[PDB]
């Protein structure tokens with residue numbers, strides 16, 4: 001699975017780690033994260049993220 005970065009603040013979503021404090025368990029692909037989730041650091045929505053390639 002691919003890493004995704006927040007293009008506003010630089011937070012990296014790592015699917016191996018998830019974001020468990022906000023209910024995103026380890027092993028969750030970015031596409032499967034609920035669409036109301038926001039960047040844990042800067043608070044922007046998923047639409048400001050992009051695949052790290």
Ligand SMILES: [Co+2]
Pocket residue numbers: 006007008009010011039040041042043044
């Ligand atoms: Co951010």
